[PDB]
Design a protein around this ligand. Structure first.
Ligand SMILES: CCO[C@@H](Cc1ccc(OCCc2ccc(OS(C)(=O)=O)cc2)cc1)C(=O)O
Ligand code: NA
Length: 259
């Protein structure tokens, strides 16, 4: 109706505020501070320094591993976030895992842009900031992991979305009817339609200065799926060629069902 949309939107936004320890506003308040600045990692010296306060494998592999720790935590938060999206809990458990299974990485990269600026990104729960040049100085193929995400982030951040916009966007990413193997594809479809509808109305209302934001945001979902398959391919390549580089068991299984 009209109160049903406020209801849908509000419940989704509160879930977002509840379940994600880190969000765009909080990351911005840090990249600007002061409330204890973020330790900077721009070289091996500071990297080891930062690790000693935030294994014994090669540097590149230790980072590969920490990025995975971040993903695992985000997958957990996304699951709790999803259970709160109106109608998600009513879905069959198999449909819930299928949705989470096929949509966590799109959601992860959609949200990672929040902690990134053109010079680097926030790590260690906000207490650290790693340099983009440093990530690029890493041995190949490890230096190829983050750079593409920075390319995406700069274009995504150019849209200037705030957390309320992002919470709706992530909800739309998760409640996808295209995911293979869905049981009640019809209900999920109704959810998707309602979420995309309120997202668009919310954008027009939250961003009156850019009436073309909705379409530009939708183009991003497209670039995200692309970024993800490219990411998944690089992770497989690294795990397969680099003997010390391993894949966390949960992430290994998620990657198995995506393709
Ligand atoms: C390379 C593994 O990629 C992850 C996705 C990912 C990628 C990057 C990412 O970036 C988080 C930022 C970060 C950068 C460095 C880091 O290491 S450190 C040693 O500086 O703490 C920790 C987090 C989060 C998830 C996967 O496939 O699950
Ligand atoms: Na249909």
């Amino acid at each position: 109706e009209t109160a049903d949309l406020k209801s849908l939107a509000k419940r989704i936004y509160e879930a977002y505020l509840k379940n994600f320890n880190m969000n765009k506003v909080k990351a911005r308040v840090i990249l600007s501070g002061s409330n204890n600045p973020p330790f900077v990692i721009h070289d091996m010296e500071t990297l080891c320094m930062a690790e000693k306060t935030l294994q014994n494998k090669e540097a590149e592999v230790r980072i590969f591993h920490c990025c995975q720790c971040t993903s695992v935590e985000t997958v957990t938060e996304l699951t709790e976030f999803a259970k709160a999206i109106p109608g998600f809990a009513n879905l069959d458990l198999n449909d819930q895992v299928t949705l989470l299974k096929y949509g966590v990485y799109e959601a992860i990269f959609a949200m990672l842009s929040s902690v990134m600026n053109k010079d680097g990104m926030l790590v260690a729960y906000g207490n650290g900031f790693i340099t983009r040049e440093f990530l690029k100085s890493l041995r190949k193929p490890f230096c190829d992991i983050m750079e593409p995400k920075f390319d995406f982030a700069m274009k995504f951040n150019a849209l200037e979305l705030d957390d309320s916009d992002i919470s709706l966007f992530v909800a739309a990413i998760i409640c996808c009817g295209d995911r293979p193997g869905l049981l009640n594809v019809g209900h999920i479809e109704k959810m998707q339609e309602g979420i995309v509808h309120v997202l668009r109305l919310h954008l027009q209302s939250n961003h009156p200065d850019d009436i073309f934001l909705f379409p530009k945001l939708l183009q991003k979902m497209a670039d995200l799926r692309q970024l993800v398959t490219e990411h998944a391919q690089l992770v497989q390549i690294i795990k397969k060629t680099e003997s010390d580089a391993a894949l966390h068991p949960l992430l290994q299984e998620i990657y198995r069902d995506m393709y």
